[PDB]
Amino acid sequence: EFKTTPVDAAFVEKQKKILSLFYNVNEISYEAEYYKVAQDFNIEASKDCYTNMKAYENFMMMYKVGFLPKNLEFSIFYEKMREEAIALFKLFYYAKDFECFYKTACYARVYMNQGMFLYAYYIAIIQRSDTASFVLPAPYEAYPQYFVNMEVKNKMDYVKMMDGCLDEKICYNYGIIKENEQFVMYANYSNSLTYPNNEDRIAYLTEDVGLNAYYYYFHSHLPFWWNSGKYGAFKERRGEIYFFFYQQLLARYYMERLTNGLGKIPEFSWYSPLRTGYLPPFNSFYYPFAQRSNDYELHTEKNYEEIRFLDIYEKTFFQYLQQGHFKAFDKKIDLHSSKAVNFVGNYWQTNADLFEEDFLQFYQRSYEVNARRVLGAAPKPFNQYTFIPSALDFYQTSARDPAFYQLYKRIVQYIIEFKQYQVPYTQEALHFVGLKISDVKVDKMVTFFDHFDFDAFNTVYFSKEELKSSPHGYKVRQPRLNHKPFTVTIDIKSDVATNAVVKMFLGPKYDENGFPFSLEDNWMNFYELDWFVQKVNPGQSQITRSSTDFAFFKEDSLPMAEIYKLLDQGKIPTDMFNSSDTMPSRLMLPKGTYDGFPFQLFVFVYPYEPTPKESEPFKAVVPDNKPFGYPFDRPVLPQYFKQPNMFFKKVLVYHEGELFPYLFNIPHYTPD
Amino acid sequence: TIKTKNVDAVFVEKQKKILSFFQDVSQLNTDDEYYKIGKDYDIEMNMDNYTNKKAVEEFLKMYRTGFMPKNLEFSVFYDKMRDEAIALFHLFYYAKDFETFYKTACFARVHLNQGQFLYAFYIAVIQRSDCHGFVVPAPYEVYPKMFMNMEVLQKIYVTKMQDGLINPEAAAKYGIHKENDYFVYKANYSNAVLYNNEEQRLTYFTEDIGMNAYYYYFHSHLPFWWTSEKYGALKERRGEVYFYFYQQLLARYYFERLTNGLGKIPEFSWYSPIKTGYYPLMLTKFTPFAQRPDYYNLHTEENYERVRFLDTYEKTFVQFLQKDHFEAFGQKIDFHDPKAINFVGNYWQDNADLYGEEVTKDYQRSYEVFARRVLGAAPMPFDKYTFMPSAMDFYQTSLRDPAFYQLYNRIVEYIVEFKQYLKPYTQDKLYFDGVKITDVKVDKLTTFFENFEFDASNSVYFSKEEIKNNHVHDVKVRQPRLNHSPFNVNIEVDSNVASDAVVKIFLAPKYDDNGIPLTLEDNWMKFFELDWFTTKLTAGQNKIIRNSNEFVIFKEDSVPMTEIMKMLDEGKVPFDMSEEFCYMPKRLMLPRGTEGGFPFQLFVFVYPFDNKGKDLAPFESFVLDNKPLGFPLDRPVVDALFKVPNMYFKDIFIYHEGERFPYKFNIPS
Ligand SMILES: *[C@@H]1O[C@H](CO)[C@@H](O[C@@H]2O[C@H](CO)[C@@H](O[C@@H]3O[C@H](CO[C@H]4O[C@H](CO[C@H]5O[C@H](CO)[C@@H](O)[C@H](O)[C@@H]5O)[C@@H](O)[C@H](O)[C@@H]4O)[C@@H](O)[C@H](O[C@H]4O[C@H](CO)[C@@H](O)[C@H](O)[C@@H]4O)[C@@H]3O)[C@H](O)[C@H]2NC(C)=O)[C@H](O)[C@H]1NC(C)=O
């Protein structure tokens, strides 16, 4: 009951090579294969490992100067850095074949900044079409310092310096135990000291490792600085998925807020104090992460120039809308087409497609980068290779900061302002003639917390001796949200014999007040649970769909220990290779309440139009003509949403066992 | 020991007529023939005597409506006043020949406001081709009230009211002495009575009479409101000239900051308070200059509409940056093109060339103007001719106000933003085949303060009696000013093949505030050009000696008019006043050192002098080169793609000798 895929022996060899660069990423083992291979890799004499001569020579130019030194923090949001990671990726991506890529990576694993190496390496593995099917470690196993609060990281460093536990009893009381000769450290989510306000209610979501990893995978599947020509016809839809990704994520987040009684995502101004502070429980080699207080004044001497830029970046968009048709980055933008939809997203992300070039150029300033800089609260960088980090400097920690959700809310509002220019769906575009949903039934929907382990060994240091055998076994254990399986049953009268699409969303039923949401105001608050095609036949029939089969959710990634165990059996975990960029399903449902929190499930059935065969960047691109998020991709006329083939069903989400995650990490106490 | 030049009969006569207009400037000598000419001079009747029929007629329409009254204070930053100045300028500028020009000035001296007249006349003498090579007095001799504090002014008034000294030994205690037939007044900088913040540390530079004269000349040489058609190939480089003047100045200013322990010019916001106040000790015949208190809220009620304009002006530029290529003001513009500096500079200046027109118009609001006005903290002008002056209403006073440096720093930074779109120079563009600088040595560099006197008589009103006997020149101001010893730069160069070469010398700081060595990457706009010249290299090894006294970019102290009247009787003219008048003064080349030797660096660059391709000699004898202003540091640098054998960075230290503080020169007993 963990999805398997069989896999042959040539595969095992290549997968083992790729996985091996992730062992002890923070130090160098002189007797690892990678070290020998890098010693033996003559880079000057290797023009013929590369499909692209320019990339090679471009790398050598920067190479001869020198790169970002080992041990410094890496972030693509600083330019000098970005130009280097991009050079590294071009090398990885234009390597003739696998041998070539492996020597290049070994070299980089040895001689280059570990952050930069891991960033380029992940992206290249996802992007190279000969590596497309290989599995990667979960990002929290590759960069545990981005996923572990200081408290836990310190406890582990402490256990290491002592070479183990003084005595068991002392240790157990501090949440430190041995299991099968490995160390396990119980971890709480952070308290009122890092989230000095109500946002702490939600720390179990915002600090969730799955949810942070998801954002990282999203970025690495199509990074802003890269064009999307690798993906064919998807190029003309890149901006669409940008909106969708953020609209869905914020919809997921607002639902968490509702169950924890927290109301709307706050709005703000660049010219005003921002309310919800955040003190990141992280440090880099030199600096504690930058802290932002409650009521932090965004508008100060240090951010004035940035704020001017941000301000006119948004107001330009207003000017576009005001005008309908306008000259923008080559063509005339007409707001009534869908070349408009694409433009809108590329505009807000300042991605490579906006400029219709291959890679983001050195002088093109991004809206999102400057926003993160203002909101990150950090002091200005010490030099081009040394910045003071904040949660917003990385996709791995971004979702920990309340400001992150506020910033994307603002962008999503802006896009929704443009979406006011889109013609709404008519009766005839949504009516499925000859078919009616007569009823929807759902099993009990139940959430709970349960423990979850990962190996954090990459954040622990090891002697020359211990390294000779790839040492690990430093596990973090944490209560994480989860739900039970449940089945949706859909009942249908049908005249016709066609293939059909069934979509299901979850959205709010009541606002923070107690009033029924009205669709005109709530369509942006629905997130997709599922999509699939079904043969329908006339009469009454019924489709059953288990939550374990929902399209947009995955199983927890396996740890590397387990990946290797499986490899020795010719086995690969499906969800880790066929769909890493997908939301973990443990977070499928907001945390419920013991009585049951009211949400609603929208079930929509429409005719299926045979759409060709692609191989797009994400799981969110289903083989359909339909816009992403359809029929909730755009403003609603409510009288058109009483279609026989639509059905809004009230459902309560329960919760069972302890309502608070800390109750799982108390020494002489066991929960429920 | 003042660089001379010889001169003929016709020259001296004209030059005397020209200098006649700068003495006793605020009064009229009934008996002087300039007056007899002036009173009766008929413009209508003389229409055939001007190159431009419509300029005469335009002037005439305005003159009947009415020009600004006399004694009222003149500033070009106000519509009506400026319009009258331009109408007057045109008339001077389109006079057929000298006689006509001379007479038109006579009329204008007699009939029109003093400041308006001198403003227009000064510019006219600089712009008229038949006038090229003539000499004008120093701005400080013409407008003395603007180059000195109240205390001094008032001592001058008191002495004049008493017709001398009631008690010479008492007057002595106040720094007032009779030296033969002169009254000499010692003057402190303002910090000697006012230390209302750390900016007052810099008064020996910001209040310096030469520096302030320097800005005035720069304005006059090519005022913002006029096209540069006259200067030919500089028309296509005007924005570049505007950026570079300001870039060089702020580097120079910054140097002064570093040596008094002050660091970066602070950023500001039209929507927030601005830190440092400005409390001017200048008087105007009619009013005090306006103060800005510390923490002054730039966004108060009177300023709402002003700030909306200024914020939009800026935001429109930020829009340009965001879209790379665009159409504005009738021009397709590409920010990838280095030539785009021309537009960038022209836009920030709202000059006539921005619009491809000869003169700017009222509806074309300037950013500089309204920025000046808001930061000047004045109340609303009472009407078209009655305003409360602040330092920034005049070119002769601007450098006094720390806010001025904040305002142009901001402008320069936006141009630097544009400059980020330019690709950095590669090795090949900079590398000088077979040429290597092997050593550089420099004589000791010492700064020091030294007394300087200027004729301040125009600040004073003489009696009918005194005007007739010509007793109009007995008031001098003595003041300690910055200076430095002359120094040689010894450069040793190697080259395979003999070749014609260009040598450039720059000054830049060694460390930031934290004491980390400067990367070129962050700091290429903090380099200040000292000199360029050409030499001929030979096969083998070369020794190049260059003295500070011969740097092309700086001038000598100008001579007082009285001393020029003396020279004209001998057929001599002060060379640096004729053709180098708008250069920075030599004595201000170096920032004030420290007793220990403050750390700086010399950058020497040697490159091939191919031929004379693109060649500036109409405006400035500055750029006889195809090369950007401030080449090779006119754009971003990558340290490792940049350094080549024909470059040398030498560490140097600037020392200071003698009295540290100007006021120690002004003590009695
Ligand atoms: C205390 O405060 C007050 C208030 O501010 C000050 O009062 C002002 O004083 C000045 C004097 O310094 C006055 O200006 C003068 O006004 C005269 C007349 O003004 C009008 O008439 C002009 C002439 O035309 C007339 O023609 C016929 C007559 O046959 C009539 O049909 C018609 O009504 C006209 O009145 C008009 O052209 C003009 O538009 C006025 O409405 C002027 O004669 C005089 O002009 C001379 O001076 C100018 C100086 O620059 C010069 O340009 C001209 O060539 C001309 O020779 C002069 O300007 C103000 O009128 C007066 N203001 C008010 C509101 O009353 C006062 O000075 C101050 N006192 C002290 C001690 O400080």
Q: Where are the domains of chain B?
A: 1-188+451-481+558-571, 189-421, 422-450+482-557+572-669
B367 phi and psi, to 5 degrees? -80, -40
Residue B492 CB burial class (10 angstroms; 0-12, 13-18, ≥19): middle
Inter-chain residue contact A312 with B319, CB threshold 8 Å: yes
Q: Which residue type, as a one-letter code, is found at position B559? A: V
A422 DSSP 8-state letter: S
B139 CA → ligand 1 middle, Å? 33
CA A26 to chain CA mean position, Å: 24
B433 DSSP 8-state letter: T
Q: Please, are residues A134 and A127 in contact by the beta-carbon 8 Å criterion?
A: no
Find the angle CA(A572)-CA(A573)-CA(A574) to the nearest 5 degrees: 105
What would you measure as the largest C-alpha separation in chain B, in angstroms? 75
| Separation between Cα atoms, residue A474 and residue B25, nearest integer Å | 89
Cis peptide before B168 (omega within 30 of 0): no
Q: Which atom from ligand 1 is nearest to the alpha carbon of B70? A: 50
> Is B420 in CB contact (< 8 Å) with chain A?
yes
CA A512 to chain CA mean position, Å: 28
> Is B322 in CB contact (< 8 Å) with chain A?
yes
| Separation between Cα atoms, residue A63 and residue A67, nearest integer Å | 7
Distance from CA of B347 to the nearest CA of A (A): 18
Collect all residues of chain B within an 8 Å Cβ-Cβ radius of residue A317: none
> Is B438 in CB contact (< 8 Å) with chain A?
no
| Separation between Cα atoms, residue B113 and residue B38, nearest integer Å | 14
CA B12 to chain CA mean position, Å: 27
Q: For residue B136, give every residue at least 6 positions away whose Cβ sits within 8 Å of its Cβ, in sequence order, or none.
A: B18, B22, B122, B125, B126, B577, B581
B386 CA → ligand 1 middle, Å? 15
CA B284 to chain CA mean position, Å: 22
Q: CA of B265: how far to CAs of B256, B299, B368, B420, in Å? A: 11, 21, 18, 21
Q: Please, are residues B527 and B503 in contact by the beta-carbon 8 Å criterion?
A: no
Q: Which residues pair with A530 in a beta bridge?
A: A504
Closest partner CB to A271 (pick from B266, B271, B421): B271
Pairing of strands A435-442, A487-494: antiparallel
Q: Please, are residues B519 and B536 in contact by the beta-carbon 8 Å criterion?
A: no
CA B94 to chain CA mean position, Å: 26
Encoded tokens for A665: 């990490």
Residue B549 CB burial class (10 angstroms; 0-12, 13-18, ≥19): exposed
| Separation between Cα atoms, residue A112 and residue A229, nearest integer Å | 29
DSSP H stretches of helix in A94-230: 98-111, 114-127, 139-142, 150-161, 168-172, 203-206, 209-221
Sheet with B598-608, side-by-side order of all strands: B176-179, B182-186, B475-484, B445-455, B647-656, B598-608, B499-509, B528-537
Q: Please, are residues B243 and B341 in contact by the beta-carbon 8 Å criterion?
A: yes
Give the number of residues written for chain B. 669
Inter-chain residue contact B267 with A309, CB threshold 8 Å: no
| Separation between Cα atoms, residue A304 and residue A552, nearest integer Å | 41
Encoded tokens for B435: 């040429």
Find the angle CA(B257)-CA(B262)-CA(B265) to the nearest 5 degrees: 75
Distance linking the first and last C-alpha atoms of chain A: 25
Sole residue written with tokens 């021309």: B342
HSE-CB at B65 with a 13 A cutoff on CA atoms is: 12
Sole residue written with tokens 């008019």: B561
Q: Is the CB of B66 under 6 A from ligand 1?
A: yes
Distance from CA of A106 to the nearest CA of B (A): 27
| Separation between Cα atoms, residue B128 and residue B98, nearest integer Å | 9
Encoded tokens for A457: 């060994």
Q: Which residue type, as a one-letter code, is found at position B457? A: S
Q: Please, are residues A484 and A579 in contact by the beta-carbon 8 Å criterion?
A: no
Pairing of strands A183-186, A176-178: antiparallel
Sole residue written with tokens 């992280």: A282
Q: For residue A577, give every residue at least 6 positions away whose Cβ sits within 8 Å of its Cβ, in sequence order, or none.
A: A5, A133, A134, A135
Angle between helices A238-259 and A402-418 (to 10 degrees): 130
Encoded tokens for B261: 């322990």
Encoded tokens for B153: 């002014």
Specify the DSSP element, H or E, that contains A416: helix A402-418
What is the sign of the dihedral through the CA atoms of A648, A654, A659 and A664? negative
Encoded tokens for B61: 């329409």
| Separation between Cα atoms, residue B254 and residue B262, nearest integer Å | 9
Q: Please, are residues B524 and B542 in contact by the beta-carbon 8 Å criterion?
A: no
| Separation between Cα atoms, residue B616 and residue B629, nearest integer Å | 11
Q: Please, are residues A97 and A117 in contact by the beta-carbon 8 Å criterion?
A: no
**Nearest of B587, B584, B596, B586 to residue B654 by alpha carbon:** B596
A128 DSSP 8-state letter: S
Q: For residue A247, give every residue at least 6 positions away whose Cβ sits within 8 Å of its Cβ, in sequence order, or none.
A: A412, A524, A629
Q: Which atom from ligand 1 is nearest to the alpha carbon of B66? A: 52
**Nearest of A503, A330, A342 to residue A415 by alpha carbon:** A342
CA A148 to chain CA mean position, Å: 17
Collect all residues of chain B within an 8 Å Cβ-Cβ radius of residue A313: 322
The CATH classification number of B422-450+482-557+572-669 equals 2.60.40.1520
Specify the DSSP element, H or E, that contains A63: helix A53-65
What is the sign of the dihedral through the CA atoms of A209, A212, A216 and A217? positive
B393 CA → ligand 1 middle, Å? 27
Method: X-ray
Helices (H) and strands (E) in chain A, counts: 21, 19
| Separation between Cα atoms, residue B212 and residue B208, nearest integer Å | 6
Give the number of residues written for chain A. 672
Specify the DSSP element, H or E, that contains B450: strand B445-455
Dihedral of the alpha carbons of B628, B629, B632, B638, in degrees to the nearest 10: -90
HSE-CB at A556 with a 13 A cutoff on CA atoms is: 21
Resolution (A): 2.8
| Separation between Cα atoms, residue B290 and residue B288, nearest integer Å | 6
> Is B314 in CB contact (< 8 Å) with chain A?
yes
Find the angle CA(A298)-CA(A302)-CA(A308) to the nearest 5 degrees: 70
A582 DSSP 8-state letter: S
Angle between helices B79-93 and B114-127 (to 10 degrees): 40
B89 CA → ligand 1 middle, Å? 27
Specify the DSSP element, H or E, that contains A300: none
Q: CA of B455: how far to CAs of A546, B18, B142, B588, in Å? A: 98, 18, 9, 21
Encoded tokens for A623: 């083989």
Q: Is the CB of B515 under 6 A from ligand 1?
A: no
Q: CA of A251: how far to CAs of A243, A247, A248, A524, in Å? A: 12, 6, 5, 7
**Nearest of B210, B279, B281 to residue B479 by alpha carbon:** B210
| Separation between Cα atoms, residue A370 and residue A302, nearest integer Å | 12
List, as own/partner pairs, every contact residues A146-149 make where C-beta atoms lie below 8 angstroms and the sequence separation is at least 24, other chains included: A146/A212, A146/A282, A146/A394, A146/A396, A146/A397, A147/A209, A147/A212, A147/A213, A147/A396, A147/A454, A147/A456, A148/A187, A148/A456, A148/A459, A148/A476, A149/A187, A149/A188, A149/A189, A149/A190, A149/A194, A149/A207, A149/A281, A149/A282
With CA atoms as reference, the chain A residue closest to B312 would be A312
Q: CA of A547: how far to CAs of A451, A527, A558, B628, in Å? A: 21, 15, 20, 67
Inter-chain residue contact A299 with B322, CB threshold 8 Å: no
Inter-chain residue contact B322 with A316, CB threshold 8 Å: yes
With CA atoms as reference, the chain A residue closest to B410 would be A305
Q: Is the CB of B69 under 6 A from ligand 1?
A: yes
Q: Which atom from ligand 1 is nearest to the alpha carbon of B69? A: 50
- Domains assigned to chain A: 1-188+451-480+557-570 (no CATH), 189-421 (1.10.1280.10), 422-450+481-556+571-672 (2.60.40.1520)
- Secondary structure (3-state) at B434: coil
Chain A and chain B share a number of CB contacts under 8 A equal to 36
Encoded tokens for B659: 């009295």
Q: CA of B106: how far to CAs of A185, A417, B82, B128, in Å? A: 96, 67, 20, 17
Encoded tokens for B411: 């402008």
The CATH classification number of B189-421 equals 1.10.1280.10
| Separation between Cα atoms, residue B76 and residue B116, nearest integer Å | 9
Encoded tokens for A183: 């160390």
Pairing of strands A571-573, A474-483: unpaired
Collect all residues of chain B within an 8 Å Cβ-Cβ radius of residue A304: 267-269
Pairing of strands B598-608, B499-509: antiparallel
Q: What are the percentages of helix, strand and coil residues in chain B, rounded to 5?
A: 40, 20, 40
> Is B622 in CB contact (< 8 Å) with chain A?
no
**Nearest of B213, B239, B230, B216 to residue B619 by alpha carbon:** B230
With CA atoms as reference, the chain B residue closest to A367 would be B322
| Separation between Cα atoms, residue A620 and residue A528, nearest integer Å | 10
Closest partner CB to A308 (pick from B314, B420, B421): B314
- Secondary structure (3-state) at B41: coil
Inter-chain residue contact B268 with A304, CB threshold 8 Å: yes
* Fold match between domain B189-421 and domain B422-450+482-557+572-669: no
Q: Which atom from ligand 1 is nearest to the alpha carbon of B67? A: 52
